[PDB]
Structure 1
């Protein structure tokens, strides 16, 4: 009994793991995930940067970051409005870095941006043109999370 039931439950657990993996594949598919491409998702809610980071972190994802023009357009299409990107110069003013770490390898700054305007701007929002504008991390913009290809 004991050992047989124990061996069975290991197979029951592996079966459930396979099923959950499949469920995740189906949900990603219905969410628009393209083959071998990272995908972006939003609940269309606007909130401050820290809340977006906490929200995407919970979902085991990260705040959306475009690494090229294609991804930048992908994020733009998903958000439909201004959306925070996972990029900030909070550590050293004027020096933008990915929240995941490192200096920028691609950018699409609007003319004369980033400018740390007025009282200060350490976050970044992709606007309705695909262009970028640094803005207050306290302002509320659309939450867009990113998941791996």
Structure 2
């Protein structure tokens, strides 16, 4: 079961919460990770298409599209490539076309484009974004 405002009550329920903020309250990737971890959770990992649907549904209920959200995607070692901050394997991927491209060699964190594509892009970790936590 999920906490109130994070999901449903069934044993298989996955718990996510959107944090959409104005520019003066958006956070870097590391700040967002720390915020979610302070609650006992982490930045959201999207481990399969079912979790993707869950998050997309939350976005539709928000009444706001096209927003960008930090996910728990962070680059590891050169041989690892991208990892999830919660330690789960990156088995499922939904990178946008041509991503991750490490554009200009400065893109080590992953963001979700909150539109129907639900696609991922690697971007500079110091950008200020909205974020999604899990618990």
Verify same fold: TM over 0.5.
Answer: yes
Contact 2:43 2:86 in 1 (8 A): no
Greater fraction of residues in helix: 1
Partner of 1:87: 73
Q: Which residue number corresponds to residue 47 of structure 1? A: 27
* Structure whose alpha-carbon radius of gyration is higher: 1
Are positions 1:139 and 2:123 aligned together? no
Where does residue 62 of structure 2 map in the other structure? none
Whole-Å separation in 1 of the counterparts to 2:29 and 2:110: 9
CA contact (8 A) 2:107 2:122 kept: yes
Aligned partners of 2:40 and 2:78: how far apart in 1?
27
Structure 1 position 68 matched with structure 2 position 44: no
Give the whole-Å Cα distance in 2 for the aligned partners of 1:33 and 1:103. 23
RMSD: 2.2
Q: Which runs of 5+ in 2 are unaligned?
A: 60-64
Residues in 2 aligned to 1:122 and 1:109: alpha-carbon distance in whole angstroms: 14
Note closer, same or farther for the CA distance 1:124–1:107 as it changes in structure 2 (3 Å cut): same
**SS at structure 2 position matched to 1:41:** strand
Q: Specify the alignment match of 1:33 in structure 2.
A: 7
Structure 1 runs of 4+ with >4 Å offset: none
SS in 1 for 2:73: strand
Deviation at 1:124, TM superposition (A): 0.4
SS at match of 1:28: coil
Structure 1 residues 92 and 100, CA, compared in 2 at 3 Å: closer, same or farther? farther
Q: TM-score, normalised by structure 1?
A: 0.71
Unaligned runs of 5+ in 1: 1-24
**1:102 shift after superposition:** 5.1
